Amino acid sequence: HMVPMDKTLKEFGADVQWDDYAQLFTLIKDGAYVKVKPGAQTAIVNGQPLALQVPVVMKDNKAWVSDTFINDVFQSGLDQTFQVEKRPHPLNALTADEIKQAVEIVKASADFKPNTRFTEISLLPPDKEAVWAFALENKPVDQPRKADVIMLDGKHIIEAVVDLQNNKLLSWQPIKDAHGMVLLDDFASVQNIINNSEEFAAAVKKRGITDAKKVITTPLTVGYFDGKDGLKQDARLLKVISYLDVGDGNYWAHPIENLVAVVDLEQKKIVKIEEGPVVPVPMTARPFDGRDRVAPAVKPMQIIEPEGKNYTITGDMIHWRNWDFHLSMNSRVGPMFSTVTYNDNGTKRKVMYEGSLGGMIVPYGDPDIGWYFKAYLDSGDYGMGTLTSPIARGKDAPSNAVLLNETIADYTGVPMEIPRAIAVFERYAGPEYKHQEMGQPNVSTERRELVVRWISTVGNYDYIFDWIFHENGTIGIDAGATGIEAVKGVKAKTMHDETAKDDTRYGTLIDHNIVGTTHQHIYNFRLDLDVDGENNSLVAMDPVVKPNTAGGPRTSTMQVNQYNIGNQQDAAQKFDPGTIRLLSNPNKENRMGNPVSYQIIPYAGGTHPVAKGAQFAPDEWIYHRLSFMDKQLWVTRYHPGERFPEGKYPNRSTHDTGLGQYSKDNESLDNTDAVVWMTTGTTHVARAEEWPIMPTEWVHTLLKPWNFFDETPTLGALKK
Amino acid sequence: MVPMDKTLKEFGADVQWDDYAQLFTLIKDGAYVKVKPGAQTAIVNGQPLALQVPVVMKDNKAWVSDTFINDVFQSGLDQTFQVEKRPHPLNALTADEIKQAVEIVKASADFKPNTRFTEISLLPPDKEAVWAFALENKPVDQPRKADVIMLDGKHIIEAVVDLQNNKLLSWQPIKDAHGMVLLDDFASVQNIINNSEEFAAAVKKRGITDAKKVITTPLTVGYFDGKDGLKQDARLLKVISYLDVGDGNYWAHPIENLVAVVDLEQKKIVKIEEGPVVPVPMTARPFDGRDRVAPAVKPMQIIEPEGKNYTITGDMIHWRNWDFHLSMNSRVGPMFSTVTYNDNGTKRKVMYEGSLGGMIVPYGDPDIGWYFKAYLDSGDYGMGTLTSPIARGKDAPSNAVLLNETIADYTGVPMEIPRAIAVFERYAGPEYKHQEMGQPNVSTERRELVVRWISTVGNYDYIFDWIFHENGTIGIDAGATGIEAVKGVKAKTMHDETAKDDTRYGTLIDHNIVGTTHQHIYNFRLDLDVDGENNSLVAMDPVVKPNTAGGPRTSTMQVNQYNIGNQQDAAQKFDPGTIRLLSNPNKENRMGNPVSYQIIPYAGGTHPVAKGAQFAPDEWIYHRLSFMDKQLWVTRYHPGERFPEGKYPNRSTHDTGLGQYSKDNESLDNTDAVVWMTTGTTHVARAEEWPIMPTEWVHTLLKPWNFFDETPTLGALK
Ligand SMILES: [Ca+2]
Ligand SMILES: [Ca+2]
Ligand SMILES: [Cu+2]
Ligand SMILES: [Cu+2]
């Protein structure tokens, strides 16, 4: 039995290239680079020969292979990229079996109800000291594997802990006043509830819509306004904004402006319809998928690694040059980078215990009925890991990437495998260093970066996160944004129309009858750096101009004001990118007697205007609830339950339970276990170039070794 | 027949042999060639080629016809380079034109023996005529002319020559101008130091046994209103010295607190300054890998097997919607001219001319070896002349095309710089994406076209990337690598007695070595013509305002928009939370918004950012170089206003650059504007940067702002 080679390999996700001159197929998938000629009894996999019992057969310009070919070639072992993990790492995410087991254990209590959903099922953080001992000494972790199981019982949150080793429930705790995040079934519920509302269909008819079945809803959290929004605090509510489906694939381009429904998800009813002035729906077709466009003629470009990759993935442990780290997936915040070490001439040095997205927010600037409450807490309120967008091979990541699948629990407690959840790729990044001494031979070396990329889409916007490991010890974290603008329907077609000035008070006119409402994108990263050890201090170095007291012609000099920042409140600060902020180990020095440090750069640039803080007056509730928005650098003491800058349960939160809380108490940051949080944000004023789809815009952050090493780290191995 | 591997390697092509496929793959610049031994045909950029003589194998080595390279690589099947039948009027002087210009000035009775040439460059035709050539194919009516700037000993003279008519048009001595540093000045300084008995005696006192191991570096002396003791009419350089210990890295062995002042016309040392004795740091610190073994790395190639998406016609680059002209200047390096974006068939002006304006690397230490130290790399040393040829595959990616460029050397002889500029397309993530829940994904790849140039001035190496985005954005990024300028000190570690004093002005980065704090400050001159000549500068400041519309919000996000109508206000600090546009008030997009580009002088960087000059405002460097202290400048177009530091900045007594250009109250309203962007870093050193500094980058951007009507990369409508 034999299958058509081209079709089968494409199903499988391999790139298939035929060279008619060479009579050669080149097949590429992840770490496998394969060469095979029709009729040959050997193929080449990553430069190594593989015997084929059944050769590729060409017949009438059509290739056929055996139905074992794909497994024989790609799973041969000659692709060495993935290796089997001997002893499981204690930070490995919950397996499918462990998820199913946790869901069985909670279902075995009399309190479980059939409408109960799971907001999160995740590994309970094992003891940090023990985890580091596993990574650095191979000391086994004695404590049992546990899962945190967070349930939504109607509107009530319950935190359960289950012991997986012993198969028992350890705790079951109602969380008073907490609201749950938005779950996947809420999207369908809102759409269904609107479809069944007589009142809503009438409201929609008054605004020009002839067919109410073409209305697309989007669910938004309502925030908190101490009753000014007229919404009861104990109820599970969402607000609902609507758009008209005109068959262009882009309902986002057809807002039904000034109509908001408030839905109670327990009652499954619209409890309030807020109605403002009638604005005709913008109707013009604005597809972004290319259906109305000519396909580009473009010459091929491929990035190829024909002998395989320089990294090895052993279970979830990535090894690459001097770097080693563990990579896992969480349903709320996505990728987590753990037990990150740098091998310094045989000694693995601690750099970071755990790093991940902390949380993010996209808050809007328009006071109108459809907008005033609008703020996407993308990870906290919607679950960015859950909403991971599978990588489009060769487009969302380069042609030389390896794409990883990742497993999490869905909202019913069923395992869910996300295909192509994370891309890993090595890239050329210019010269690592160069010196061309006049009249001498050149010295140049190439820079290589290892990128780990993850994309999550929450409604209209798509977010890309790159964690960039530099060979020289630097770590970059870049955040990209693309997708479809949230737009306001307006009466102005151009800036010459009567309502244009009022229509554009809170955003730019980017199409006829369409305003891209101004807003911010604010990302926060939680980085538990352990700079060559647990015990670290925050050090400021401010470059300053001081009078010259040394004689000679100069009136001034360049000096530095250096000081320790010993308490948390002072550590919560604006970042001046002309200053230096270090996390230093006061117990370990480099060869020159300088404390081994990492320089923390929360703002290393971006392509949109930068946010210096929150674009909200300080008496706004969103400002009060989310302190993380207004400072770029925070340092707190390590605590395994302080993970989210917005707080654990931010939906309708009445006060700051995140970084505002964590940094509040005057506890010492001197020579202790510190956690760094970086906030970086943009202020997005729209332009027509961003409509109907926004070209990817980026912000950059950096962590740089600062006297962590003794010399240029990439010089190579010493031959003496 | 000739041997294939030897012949192709001499041609500069990469040769790969695949034993499984019995296939050679040959790569050079835009040519991607496949050829089987014995085959009667080959493939060049995906197209078949008949061979006169098959590749033959003898003793497992390939042999080819002695015409193989011509037949295959110059077949015409590589379409990367095309013939230029009508030369663009901004084409740089050719080798023949350089020689002719030199003969014209040498024929004058005023030409003095031993005269040198600081600059020989095209005197460009008028801007209107050049645009009309680029946009309408209109011949420029004028003869080729050259500016010829001569140094007669220490005296500067500007001449103009008409190359068509082979005559001298003008000859003008420039009163009080000092010339830039020329190549022979480096050797003169070393020789003058080698023949000084006083200097050898001074060196002996600092513990140097062999004075012929002393390596000099020439530095310009600046201007201090006589406080440095230096006569203003003399051609002077200061000389800082290092010890050669045979590690290839003299920079690592400073002879601290010894400065010689050399008069180049007298050819002697006119002053020796001697400060405290600090033993020379002696430990070998090679950077060239002589003491190192690199880890093995698996190969990575970036391949374009059907050739490139860009075409190079003479000096005119065409790529996707972009067209521009690329030429080389001896002072500032690459110049990007007549830059247009092809919007659905109509070429629209974006930039008449853009280039490096100038740069400065000024130090922060008041001591005798340092107080005057400020490298004006382009103005004082000539960065074009000092271009560093691209190391193929390392300094630029394996899919680059490397261009040669020709300029005049200081004696007036044409000089061809091999691999002077790299051009390459690169993958740059998704151009855009939207994964609508439950629907098919939409993603497209981003491609960027990078034009990269590297120049090395003494110890530091600078990389400039001009990045053309398919979507209309232009990035300009500046990278710095090379060897830090270091101070010799007594402290071995921060525990030693002198450590605190030793590190007052820089970090201790090695035993006895301090990386003195300084800035790197770059300025780009960008004659943007935003869809036309006549433009205005517009500020948009995002602000929080009280809510007056009702409902629960206390505040809103709005913008304060206002025009900036005069030059003095246009010279400003850049707040990256604001928006600054160059707008065309005469042309609007489909929504009635003025077509504009957004100017972003600070889009990030990897070293700390300079908020301005790290100098008190009574410092002479501060007074002379105003461009250092503001990030955005906008001036009225003038073909003679090119350099932010001024035309003759060596020992300048006042600002003849941007301080002068932006001084007067003339209107920027609806007129031909030139944008200048200053971006800089404050470099505080660390051990990770010694003995060689990993490349650090700064980023700037020019973004279309309602220049288009929609996403520019969606494609043409069916
Ligand atoms: Ca820590
Ligand atoms: Ca202009
Ligand atoms: Cu946005
Ligand atoms: Cu520097």
Coordinates of N, CA and C and ligand atoms in Angstrom, one line a residue, chain B residues 361 363 460 484 518 520 607 683 693, ligand 4:
Chain B
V361 N 31.7 61.3 19.8 CA 32.0 60.5 21.0 C 32.8 61.2 22.0
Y363 N 34.2 62.4 25.8 CA 34.5 61.7 27.1 C 34.2 62.6 28.3
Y460 N 36.9 52.2 17.7 CA 35.5 51.8 17.6 C 35.0 51.6 16.2
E484 N 37.1 49.5 23.6 CA 36.9 50.7 24.5 C 38.2 51.5 24.7
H518 N 31.5 58.0 28.7 CA 31.4 58.9 27.5 C 30.1 58.7 26.9
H520 N 27.9 58.2 23.0 CA 27.9 58.1 21.5 C 26.7 58.8 21.0
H607 N 22.0 50.5 25.2 CA 22.7 51.2 26.2 C 21.8 52.3 26.8
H683 N 27.4 55.8 27.7 CA 28.1 54.5 27.8 C 28.8 54.4 29.1
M693 N 33.8 44.8 22.6 CA 32.5 45.2 23.0 C 31.4 44.5 22.2
Ligands
CU4 CU 31.4 53.6 24.1

